Amino acid sequence: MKVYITYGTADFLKTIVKKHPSENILLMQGQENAILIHETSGDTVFQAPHAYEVIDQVGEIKHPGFAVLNNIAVTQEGRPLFENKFKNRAGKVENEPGFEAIRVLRPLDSDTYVILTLWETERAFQDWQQSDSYKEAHKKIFSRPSYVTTYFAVE
């Protein structure tokens, strides 16, 4: 239900994973830094996590080769609409090849939601992005502009 995320250099972030083998913590390397994603039903184990309620979920988190995060700033009153602009999501992404999982993460310490989709490869995402099922989700209340970050399985 709950996702915790912390960012930084990957060698360091590994020492955190090895401390909590009991917990399902994914590590991927992005441009600016590496990320730890931690899906659990209870407690964080990061110092200073970014914390999220999972409000939509598909597939499981277990070793994706590629991860894409869309980082969206929603105003405080904006949330209820946005929230149910995603309920409205068709989830045409899920019935697509290479797609391992999606999570729509409601933030608890910021205004920035995160739509996290997990893939087997970059190309799997790169495929879907050019597909029509990208443009039936985008055809024809935000604090500041959204951005996308991307991460690779560990190198």
Is 135 annotated to bind a ligand? Reply is no
- Shortest spacing between CB 100 and ligand HEM, in angstroms: 13
**Cβ contact 118:102 at 8 Å:** yes
Q: Please report the sign of the dihedral spanned by the C-alpha atoms of residue 145, residue 87, residue 56, residue 43.
A: positive
Q: In the complex with ligand HEM, which residue's Cβ is closer, 9 or 129? A: 129
Give the C-alpha separation, 74 to 79, whole Å: 6
Q: In the complex with ligand HEM, which residue's Cβ is closer, 79 or 89? A: 89
Is 92 annotated to bind a ligand? Reply is yes
Task: Copy the structure tokens of residue 42.
Answer: 């209870």
Q: In the complex with ligand HEM, which residue's Cβ is closer, 70 or 110? A: 70
Task: Copy the structure tokens of residue 69.
Answer: 């995060």
- Shortest spacing between CB 16 and ligand HEM, in angstroms: 27
- Shortest spacing between CB 98 and ligand HEM, in angstroms: 13
Give the C-alpha separation, 71 to 55, whole Å: 15
Task: Copy the structure tokens of residue 30.
Answer: 């992005």
Is 147 annotated to bind a ligand? Reply is no
Is 93 annotated to bind a ligand? Reply is yes
Give the C-alpha separation, 111 to 117, whole Å: 19
Q: Applying CB under 6 A, which residues contact ligand HEM?
A: 68, 70, 85-86, 88-93, 115, 137-138, 146, 148
- Shortest spacing between CB 6 and ligand HEM, in angstroms: 23
Helices (H) and strands (E) in the chain, counts: 4, 8
Q: In the complex with ligand HEM, which residue's Cβ is closer, 17 or 105? A: 105
Task: Cite the annotated binding site for heme b by residue number.
Answer: 89-93, 134
Task: Cite the annotated binding site by residue number.
Answer: 89-93, 134
